[PDB]
Amino acid sequence: VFSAAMYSRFVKSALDDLDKNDSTQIGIIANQVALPSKNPERINDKNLNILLDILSSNINRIESSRGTFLIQSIINFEKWWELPPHTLSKYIYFIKILCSSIPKWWQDVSMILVSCFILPIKQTVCHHDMLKYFLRMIPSSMGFIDTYLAKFFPNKNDTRRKLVNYTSNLLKLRGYCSELGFQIWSLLIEKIISIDVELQNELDELDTQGIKELSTKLDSILTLVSTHVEEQVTPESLESGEGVGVFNTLTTLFKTHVLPTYYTRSIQYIMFHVSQQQLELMDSFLVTLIDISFAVNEAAEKKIKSLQYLGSYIARAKKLSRTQIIFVASYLTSWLNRYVIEREEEVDQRGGMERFKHFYAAFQALCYIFCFRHNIFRDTDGNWECELDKFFQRMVISKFNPLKFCNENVMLMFARIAQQESVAYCFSIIENNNNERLRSSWSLATRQQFIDLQSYFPYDPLFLKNYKILMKEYYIEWSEAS
Amino acid sequence: VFSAAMYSRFVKSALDDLDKNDSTQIGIIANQVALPSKNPERINDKNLNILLDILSSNINRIESSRGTFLIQSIINFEKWWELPPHTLSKYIYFIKILCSSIPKWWQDVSMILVSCFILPIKQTVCHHDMLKYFLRMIPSSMGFIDTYLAKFFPNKNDTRRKLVNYTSNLLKLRGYCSELGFQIWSLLIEKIISIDVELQNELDELDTQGIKELSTKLDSILTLVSTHVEEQVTPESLESGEGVGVFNTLTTLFKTHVLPTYYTRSIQYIMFHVSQQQLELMDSFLVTLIDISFAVNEAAEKKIKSLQYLGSYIARAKKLSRTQIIFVASYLTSWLNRYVIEREEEVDQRGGMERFKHFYAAFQALCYIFCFRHNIFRDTDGNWECELDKFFQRMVISKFNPLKFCNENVMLMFARIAQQESVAYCFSIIENNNNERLRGSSWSLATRQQFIDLQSYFPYDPLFLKNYKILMKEYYIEWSEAS
C-alpha cells in the first residue's frame, strides 16, 4: 500500500524521530525486517531497497544505543544471500558501510557468515567475499573467526553434505587467508581422525548402520582433501607458490596427530598421496620416517610405530624409484649389520629379548619391503642388491632369532618368498621355534603390546570407495607385487 | 774354587745358618747373584743351578723376613732371559714356585716382565709365558699389570725399536688377556695420536726437519697395528670370534679420541683400513658416520667434523660398492631436499647464514663425493642416479647460496666437473659471489673462520708415511684414479 516516495518519507521521518529520542517508528520498521523468510508480512525487496539506501547514506544517524535494535534486525535477516541481485547488493553495501564505521558489528556478521559454511560453494560466494574484505580491513578479527571455525564445525553425526560443504568452505577460506591456514588444516585433521577412530572402534565393537554412515562421510571428506592437495602441491607451486606450506603443515600434523594415534585406517593416506606428487616430497617423507624410526631420545613405542610406517610405505607407494627403495634397504641392512656386530654379545647376558624390541622392529620393516619388492633387488647381472642372499641368513641364524619375535604372518610370507628366491632358508628355524614353544624369554604383559604394534600396517588397503579409486595410481595391491 | 758338592754344602749350611738368624752366608750368596751381567765375578750358571734347585725344593725355608734380601736378589737378576737353556729353566721354575707359595712377589716379577716389553717378540717368549701363567693363577694382578702397561710405555722421543717392540708385545699380551684388551687398545690409540699431533704441530711450526724421526716412528707403528688388525678381523673371525671385539674397540676409540681430536693426518687410517675388510664393517662405519653427522643433540662442530669424515670416506674407500656409495648420495640428497622444503623460508628472516652451517656441511660432503664418484652416478640408461642433473641446480640457485659458504676449492672443482657432466651450471653464481665480495647475506667473521677451517680439513687426503701408504694402495683412490 506504500509508494516508493511514501515509504522513503516514512523512514526519513522515523530517523528524524530517532534523533529526538523516539525509537517507536524505527522499531516498527526493525520488527518488519526481523520477521522470518517464510512470513509474507516481512518487508518486501522494494521497501527493503529504500531502507538500506537511506541507512547506508548516513550510517552515523543509527550509531546510538537507540539504533542498536534496527542494526541487529538487519544483521539477523534470514537467508539474506537468498535475496534478489539488486536487493542483495544493497544489503552487502549496507553491511560493508556498517562494519567500516562501527567495527563492533563485524563480530556478529562474521559469526553468521561462518555458520553458513554448511552451504555449498555455489551458495557461499558472497559470504567469502565479505570475510575476505573484512579480514583485511579488520585483521584483529582473525582470533574470534578462528574460534567460529571450531564452534561451527558439524558433528560426526550430522549430514555428510554439511560435513563435506564445511570442508569445501574451510579450504576456500584457506586460499585467501594464509594466516589461518594452519588452524584450518589442524581443525580438518582433528575432525578426520575423530571420524576414522570412531569408524574403527565401531568395527571393533562388532566382535553397523553407523559404520556405513561414517564410511561414506570419511570417504567424501578425504577424496576432497586429497583432490585439493593434488591441485595445491604442483611442481610449479613447489618452485614458487605455497606448494611448500601445504606439504609442511600436513607433515607437521602427521608427526603430531597421525603417528601418535597409530591405529587408524584412512587419515595417513593424505601423507601417502602428497608424498608421491614429486621426487623431493617422497625424499622428505622417507628421511622423516627414517629419523623417527632411529632417533636416540624417541620412545621405543614411537620407533616401532615409525618402523611399521616405513616398511608399509616402501612396499605400497607406486611412485617410488628403484633407487629410493634400495636407499631404505641399504639403510636397514647397514643399521642391522651394525646391531649384530655391536650387540649380539648382550643376548647370552642378563636380561630378556625385550631389550632388542628395536632390532625386531627394523628387521620386520625390511622383511616386509622384500615381500613386496624382492623382484627390484635382483640387479642386471642377476645378483642381489645389499647382498640380501648373504644378509638375511646372517640375521635369521643370529642369537636374536628374529623369526621367533617378529609378526608370525610376515615371517611366514618372508620365509616362503626368501626360500623361493634362494635368498634365505628359515623353515628349519621356524620348525625349531614352534617345537620349543610346544614343549630365550620375554615378559608376557609388554610382549602383547609389541605383537599388536607389529600386526598394524598403516598402508594396508583402503576400503573407502572413492578414495580407493583416487589411490590406484599411487598404490601397489598384493596382487600386483606377487 | 767350588765343586758341585762343595757349593751344594756351602748353600745347605748357609740355610742352616739362616735358621739360627745368621744372614751373613746367605747375604754373601745374595750379593754374588745381584752383581751386574757385565761383571765376571757374578755367580756362574753351574753354581746358580745348584742354588735355584735347593731353594725350589723347599721355598718355605726362605719365606721369613731374613730371606727377603736373597729373594729380591734373584728377582732382580740382570738379563735372566739371556740365561742358557737349562739355567733359564731352573730360574723360571724357581719364580713359578716363589709366586705360587708367596703371591706377594708376583707384584715385583710382573713389573720387571712388563719393563721387558721394549725387547723383540723373539726375545720375550718366556716373559709372556710367565705373564700368561700368573694372570690365570692370580687374576687380581690385572689391576697393577694394567698400571705397568702405562708406566712402561716408551716416550715419543725414545728409539723407534723400543716403541715398535712395546706395541708388538702389547698386541701379544692382548691375545691371551682379553680382560686387558680395551686398555691395551686405548693406550696404543692415545700414544699414536700423541705422535700424529706432534708431527703436525712440528710441520706447522716451520711454516726442525728432525720430524723424519716422528714420521718413521708413526709409520712403523701404524703399519704393524693395521697388519695385526688385517689378521684379527677376518670373515671367519667375525662370524664367531674376537674379530668383532677388535672392530668394536677401534670404533669406540674412533668416536672418543680420533674424531674429536681433529686435524690428525694418519690415526684415522686404522678405521679406514678395518672398515674395508668386509661389506658389513663398511656398513657399520657408514651408518656410524651418518648418525654422528645428523644426530639432534650433537654439537654443530661434531656434525661438521663427521660430515667431512663422511665425504672423504665415500670418495676414497676403494673397496666400497656402487650401492653403498649411492646409499650415502641418496641419504644426503634426501636430507638436503627436505632442508630446502622445510627451511628456505628462514633465509629472508632475522639471523645470518651461520644458522645453516649444517646445510653447507652436508652439501659440501655430497659435492666432494660427486667429484670422486660422478662416473658411478650415471646409470645403464645414461641417466643420473638421485636426479643429480636436477638436484644440484636446485641447491645452487636456492636462498642458502651454498657456493658462497662452502670450501672455495671444493666448490670450484665441483663447478668444473658439474659443468662438464651437464649436471649443474655454477660459474655465473660464482662470478656474482666474487663481484658482491669485491664491492665490500652475512656471517660473523669470528665464527666464520672456524667453519672455513673445518671444511678445509679432509681426513682421508693422502698418507705421506711411507710404508703405511703401500699397505693402503689396495684400499685407496688417489685423485689420479678418480679423475
Q: Which long-range contacts (CB under 8 A, 24 or more apart) does A228-237 make?
A: A228/A171, A229/A270, A229/A273, A229/A274, A230/A273, A230/A277, A233/A274, A233/A277, A233/A278, A233/A281, A234/A277, A235/A278
Residue type, A402: P
How many CB atoms are located within 10 Å of the residue B196 CB?
24
* Paired strand residues for B476: B317
Q: How far is CA B195 from the centre of its chain?
A: 11
Candidate from B238, B280, B334 with C-beta closest to A286? B334
The three three-digit cell numbers of residue A64, written as one number: 546510538
3-class state of residue A67 by DSSP: coil
Cα B411 from Cα B388, distance rounded (Å): 16
Q: Which residues contact B206 (CB under 8 A, 6 or more apart)?
A: none
How many CB atoms are located within 10 Å of the residue B278 CB?
20
List chain A gaps (C–N > 2.5 A) by preceding residue: 207, 439
Does the distance separating the beta carbons of A345 and B330 come in below 8 Å? no
How many CB atoms are located within 10 Å of the residue A302 CB?
17
Candidate from A286, A380, A385 with C-beta closest to B323? A385
Cα B261 from Cα B305, distance rounded (Å): 10
Q: For A339, which residue in chain B has the nearest alpha carbon?
A: B284
* Paired strand residues for A475: A317
Q: For A275, which residue in chain B has the nearest alpha carbon?
A: B338
**Chain B residues near residue A387 by CB distance under 8 angstroms:** 279
The radius of gyration of chain A from alpha carbons, rounded to an integer in Å, stands at 31
CB A288 within 8 A of CB A302: no
Cα A379 from Cα A374, distance rounded (Å): 11
Candidate from A280, A326, A342 with C-beta closest to B337? A280
**Chain A residues near residue B280 by CB distance under 8 angstroms:** 337, 340-341
Candidate from B244, B283, B341 with C-beta closest to A244? B341
CB A154 within 8 A of CB A118: yes
DSSP 8-state class, residue A383: P
Q: How many CA atoms lie within 13 A of B290 on its CB side?
A: 28
Cα A317 from Cα A282, distance rounded (Å): 9
CB B229 within 8 A of CB B270: yes
Q: How many CA atoms lie within 13 A of A353 on its CB side?
A: 18
Q: Does residue B170 belong to the interface with chain A, where contact is any CB pair within 8 Å?
A: no
Best to test chain A binding among B182, B238, B247, B284 (most A CBs inside 10 Å): B284
Candidate from B283, B296, B334 with C-beta closest to A337? B283
- Supply angle C-alpha B483, B291, B482, rounded to 5: 5
Helices (H) and strands (E) in chain A, counts: 26, 0
Residue entry with cell 665415500 = B314
DSSP 8-state class, residue A258: I
SS (HEC) of chain B: CCCHHHHHHHHHHHHHHHHCCCCHHHHHHHHHHHCCCCCCCCCCHHHHHHHHHHHHHCHHHHCCHHHHHHHHHHHCCCCHHHCCHHHHHHHHHHHHHHHHHCHHHHHHHHHHHHHHHHCCHHHHHHHHHHHHHHHHHCHHHHHHHHHHHHHCCCCCCCCHHHHHHHHHHHHHHHHHCHHHHHHHHHHHHHHHHHHHHHHHHHHHHHCCHHHHHHHHHHHHHHHHHHHHHHHHCCHHHHHCCCHHHHHHHHHHHHHHHHCCCCCCCCCCHHHHHHHCCCHHHHHHHHHHHHHHHHCCCCCHHHHHHHHHHHHHHHHHECCCCHHHHHHHHHHHHHHHHHHHHHHHHHCCCCCCHHHHHHHHHHHHHHHHHHHHHHHHHECCCCCEHHHHHHHHHHHHCCCCCHHHHCCHHHHHHHHHHHHHCCCCCCHHHHHHHHHHHHHCCCCCHHHHHHHHHHHHCCCCCCCCCHHHHHHHHHHECCHHHHC
The three three-digit cell numbers of residue A202, written as one number: 565401531
Could you tell me the sign of the dihedral formed by the alpha carbons of A452, A454, A458, A459, in that order? negative
Q: For B233, which residue in chain A has the nearest alpha carbon?
A: A341
Does the distance separating the beta carbons of B297 and A297 come in below 8 Å? yes
Cα A66 from Cα A26, distance rounded (Å): 9
Does the distance separating the beta carbons of A338 and B284 come in below 8 Å? yes
Q: Which residues contact A287 (CB under 8 A, 6 or more apart)?
A: B331, B334, B335, B337, B338
DSSP 8-state class, residue A377: G
Please give the C-alpha separations between residue B311 and each of A152, A335, B308, in angstroms, as whole numbers.
55, 19, 5
| Length, in residues, of chain A | 482
Among B residues 319-348, those touching chain A with beta carbons less than 8 Å apart: 323-324, 326-327, 330-331, 333-335, 337-338, 341-342, 344-345
Best to test chain A binding among B240, B296, B330, B359 (most A CBs inside 10 Å): B330
* Paired strand residues for B317: B476
CB B270 within 8 A of CB B233: no
Distance from CA of B233 to the nearest CA of A (A): 12
Please give the C-alpha separations between residue B376 and each of A325, B170, B315, B316, B458, in angstroms, as whole numbers.
18, 43, 11, 14, 21
Q: Which helix (H) or strand (E) holds A335?
A: helix A322-343
Q: Which residues contact B151 (CB under 8 A, 6 or more apart)?
A: B114
Cα B20 from Cα B279, distance rounded (Å): 73
Q: Is A395 exposed, middle or buried (0-12, 13-18, 19+ CB in 10 A)?
A: buried
Does the distance separating the beta carbons of B238 and A341 come in below 8 Å? yes
Cα B371 from Cα B444, distance rounded (Å): 30
Q: How far is CA B287 from the centre of its chain?
A: 21
CB B27 within 8 A of CB B39: no
Residue type, A175: G
Does the distance separating the beta carbons of A341 and B323 come in below 8 Å? no
How many CB atoms are located within 10 Å of the residue A90 CB?
20
Look at residues B92, B96, B235, B116 and name the one whose alpha carbon lies nearest to residue B166: B116
Candidate from A323, A326, A337 with C-beta closest to B280? A337
* Paired strand residues for B70: none
Does the distance separating the beta carbons of B330 and A330 come in below 8 Å? yes
Q: For A239, which residue in chain B has the nearest alpha carbon?
A: B394
Size of interface A-B (CB pairs under 8 A): 88
Among A residues 343-382, those touching chain B with beta carbons less than 8 Å apart: 344-345, 380
- B214-224 burial, b at 16+ Cβ within 10 Å, e below that, comes to bbebbbbbbbb
Candidate from A281, A330, A341 with C-beta closest to B280? A341
Cα A215 from Cα A217, distance rounded (Å): 5
Cα A115 from Cα B395, distance rounded (Å): 46
Does the distance separating the beta carbons of A386 and B337 come in below 8 Å? no
Cα A112 from Cα A130, distance rounded (Å): 11
Q: Which helix (H) or strand (E) holds A72?
A: helix A68-75
Please give the C-alpha separations between residue B16 and each of B2, B7, B29, B30, B74, in angstroms, as whole numbers.
19, 14, 14, 16, 20
Cα A54 from Cα A30, distance rounded (Å): 14
Residue type, A79: K
CB B57 within 8 A of CB B98: no
Residue type, B472: M
CB A235 within 8 A of CB A278: yes
Cα B269 from Cα A73, distance rounded (Å): 85
Best to test chain B binding among A338, A394, A395 (most B CBs inside 10 Å): A338
Q: Tell me the backbone φ, ψ of residue B435, rounded to 5 degrees.
A: -70, -45
Residue type, B225: V
Residue type, B400: F
Does the distance separating the beta carbons of B341 and A247 come in below 8 Å? yes
Among B residues 232-261, those touching chain A with beta carbons less than 8 Å apart: 238, 244, 247-248, 251
| Length, in residues, of chain B | 483
Residue-range domain boundaries for chain B? 1-483
3-class state of residue A481 by DSSP: helix
Does the distance separating the beta carbons of B338 and A330 come in below 8 Å? no
CB B426 within 8 A of CB B367: no
Distance from CA of A321 to the nearest CA of B (A): 9
Could you tell me the sign of the dihedral formed by the alpha carbons of A434, A438, A439, A445, in that order? positive
Q: Is A251 exposed, middle or buried (0-12, 13-18, 19+ CB in 10 A)?
A: buried
Does the distance separating the beta carbons of A385 and B287 come in below 8 Å? no
Tell me the structure's resolution in angstroms, rounded to a single decimal. Answer: 2.8
CB B174 within 8 A of CB B250: no
Q: For B252, which residue in chain A has the nearest alpha carbon?
A: A342
Percent helix / strand / coil, chain A, rounded to 5: 75, 0, 25
Q: For A398, which residue in chain B has the nearest alpha carbon?
A: B239
Max CA distance (Å), chain B: 103
Does the distance separating the beta carbons of A247 and B280 come in below 8 Å? no
The per-residue DSSP string of A135-191 comes to HHH-GGGHHHHHHHHHHTSPPTTS-HHHHHHHHHHHHHHHHH-GGGHHHHHHHHHHH
Q: How many CA atoms lie within 13 A of B29 on its CB side?
A: 30
Residue type, A157: N
Candidate from B283, B338, B380 with C-beta closest to A338? B283
Please give the C-alpha separations between residue B348 and each of A478, B340, B345, B392, in angstroms, as whole numbers.
47, 13, 7, 21
Q: For A237, which residue in chain B has the nearest alpha carbon?
A: B341
Cα B11 from Cα B18, distance rounded (Å): 10
Please give the C-alpha separations between residue B422 and each of A91, B385, B391, B414, in angstroms, as whole numbers.
63, 14, 12, 12
Cα A246 from Cα A284, distance rounded (Å): 14
Q: How far is CA A239 from the centre of its chain?
A: 24
Among A residues 276-305, those touching chain B with beta carbons less than 8 Å apart: 279-281, 283-284, 286-288, 295-297
**Chain B residues near residue A247 by CB distance under 8 angstroms:** 341
